Chains A and B, each alone.
Chain A
Amino acid sequence: SHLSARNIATEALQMKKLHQERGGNPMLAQQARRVLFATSIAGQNLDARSVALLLNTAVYFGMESDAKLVRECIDYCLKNDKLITVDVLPIVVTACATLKSRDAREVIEMQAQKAARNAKFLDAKDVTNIISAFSKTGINHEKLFAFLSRRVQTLARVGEFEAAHLVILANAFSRLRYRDKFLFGAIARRAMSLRERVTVNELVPLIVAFSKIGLKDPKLSKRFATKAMEYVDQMNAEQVASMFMAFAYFGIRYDQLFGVLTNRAVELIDEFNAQYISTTLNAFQRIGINNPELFDNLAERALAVVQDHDARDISKTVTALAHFGLKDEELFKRLASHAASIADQFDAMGLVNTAHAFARTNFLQQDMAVALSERSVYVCRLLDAGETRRLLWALAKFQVRDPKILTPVFNRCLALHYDFFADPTGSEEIEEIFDFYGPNFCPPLYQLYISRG
């Protein structure tokens, strides 16, 4: 299909929308990738809108910073800085979020300065899009965030935002770790002033964001709990697990809401997937509520479906089961045998959590232990002293005694010896570690350990 570059960017944006919020059809992604592979804007002149759309659609579909189209778009964004108005700013920022080159950093910083300068002349759409775009880049421009929060408060004092805008705003301001109680109070007031215009689908994400941001005020949680209790009947498994997680994050011991939520969850036990079960178990671990019938139902369902268990799901499930105490025999075997197959997907801390959960329950399988131990050499660099201690104790309980695996863990322990030997807890854990490995395996850590510091 031969088309102009603008006529290609339009269909590219449409394809991105259809693949994003209308089911992830692989054929659409493949067609878009093939179309964008041969697309170039070297000669033709385009608006900033078309170039921004092309860059965003290319970056969304997996194109890294080494491609020709991405390089041309970034060059255009670097040269013609004054043509990237507020309308086409969030698109460029969102596109550059994933890219971590030098040009991407420069473009992001320039757009941040532009947004912080013009933060008082925007509208609801522009402010919402700008804050949502700057949420994804991980930038830490606190002055810009303060300016945008002030503009949000002034613009919402006159009832401008609505349900979708409030959800996006809360998610963006919670992901950036901006604990402004006044801003979230204004967002909550605008939500409650939207009577019956905040549906369940627009109510659950708001509660999740308000839980994640970590607000000190406990009076706000009560209204969310009551409104959720009113809306329980109209929910699938996704939102049930979502509010389990959210009200675990709040940390307030509610009774009627938890009972009705458990009733609805056991009602929909035939629709739960691996991620929902893991989220529910993790939420119950965080809140401390012990519900053994629900745990039995979730364990049975997790036994029913095991292929869907991702590394995060496996880690959360085993950690919750080990902490609670309840544990199955064949479910653990299936989970360990599956994690052996996908041991190359565990993260820096998920691997430690899974290994320590399996070690703490006295469940040792050779295949899983070998896979996790061999994998525990590309992740020792990204480990805190507590996580390193947990992984070392798991290895000691696993009886690995392999220098190629042990020496990076001991290098990490030595490089973090102060936070390793001064942990308020874990003294008995380190004692057992050193009892297993003996004094001659690693001299310097022994010398430090017989000095208590």
Chain B
Amino acid sequence: LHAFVRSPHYRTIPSAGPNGIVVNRDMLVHQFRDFYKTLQHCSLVDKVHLMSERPSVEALRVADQMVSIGATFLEMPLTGMEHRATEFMESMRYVRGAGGPSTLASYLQDTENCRCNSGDVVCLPNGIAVGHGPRTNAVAHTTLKQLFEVKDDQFSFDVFTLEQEGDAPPLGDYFGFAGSNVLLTWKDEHGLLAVDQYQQKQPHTEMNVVYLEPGCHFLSFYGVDHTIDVLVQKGYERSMDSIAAAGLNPIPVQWSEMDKLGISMRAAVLPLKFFKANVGGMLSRNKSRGARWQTH
């Protein structure tokens, strides 16, 4: 598991946020340094790769390029990001240099009018959930159903459509999974609606649901590899207690300047899984898991 982050260009950081909130450049670089340190200390990411600065502030959103669905690294369409083509090529060069995939799957770049946005895709036990809304029309949903939905026994990979209102952030911002069967959402209309919809879609599975303060950006490295850490914003302390009570490990992270700039912790990193291409029917070495000699 490799995490890719981009250093912020100090000179071109905007003076004021999108709404009008002023920001501090020095505090921004300090918080990015702390974020890089606490991402290195995750004890699950094998290596953290730092990208060179680019003369843009929206290039910090390195997660608007790719979605990892199952075992495929799907590429998001270039519809409103025509100025980020070279940025995407440079990021792909960084991924190639780290031993990742040579290129990406173009299943969405060729479909007509397939306007999709990352973050609307949230992983879940043997499936994904996509958010129907302003940034993701029905053609993306039906293409994803065609490509990934499987309704067979012992091989089911089901994708769920979660309709959301027209003034909601990406589904990955306020909806996520963590630990062994733990769910995290914001305590507002969007979180309750998404939780209820997923309860209807998967009724026979009972799940732990944890409610967080609205506007509290979090990040959990959910996947096949079991983990317990959940990065959470430092300002909110009720959410930290809620996460700790569920049996998970919370890690406070200072993220005020990005919040003033509109960049979430989820959209600032690009987690990827690279598996060594075994040649000749061989198996590589895994990581030391479990306790050795339980019975001595």
Contact = CB atoms under 8 A, between A and B. Distances in A.
Q: Do chains A and B touch in the complex (CB under 8 A)?
A: yes
Contacts of A123: 47, 49
B53 A154 contact: yes
B36 interface: yes
Interface string A147-173: 000110011011110000000000000
Interface size class of A (residues with CB under 8 A): 10 to 19
A121 B93 contact: yes
B52 A158 contact: no
Contact of B36 (A120, A121, A151, A158): A158
A157 B33 CA distance: 8
B7 A154 contact: yes
Interface in B78-110: 93-94, 97-98
Nearest to B7: A154
Contacts, number: 27
Contact of A157 (B29, B49, B98): B29
A183 to B, nearest CB: 15
Nearest to A160: B50
Nearest to A155: B50
Contacts of A201: none
A118 interface: yes
Given A158-B7, A159-B37, A120 B32 contact: no
A158 B93 contact: no
Nearest to B33: A158
Contacts of A151: 52
Interface string B24-64: 00000100110011000000000101101100000000000
A151 to B, nearest CB: 7
A118 B52 contact: no
B33 A118 contact: no
Contacts of A154: 7, 50, 52-53
Nearest to B10: A157
Contacts of A158: 7, 32-33, 36, 50
Interface of B: 7, 29, 32-33, 36-37, 47, 49-50, 52-53, 93-94, 97-98
Given A121-B94, A159-B33, 8 more contacts: A120-B52, A121-B97, A121-B98, A155-B50, A157-B7, A158-B7, A158-B50, A159-B36
7 contacts: A118-B97, A154-B7, A154-B50, A154-B53, A157-B33, A158-B36, A158-B50
6 smallest CB-CB distances across A and B, nearest first, come from A121-B97, A158-B36, A158-B33, A120-B52, A154-B52, A154-B7
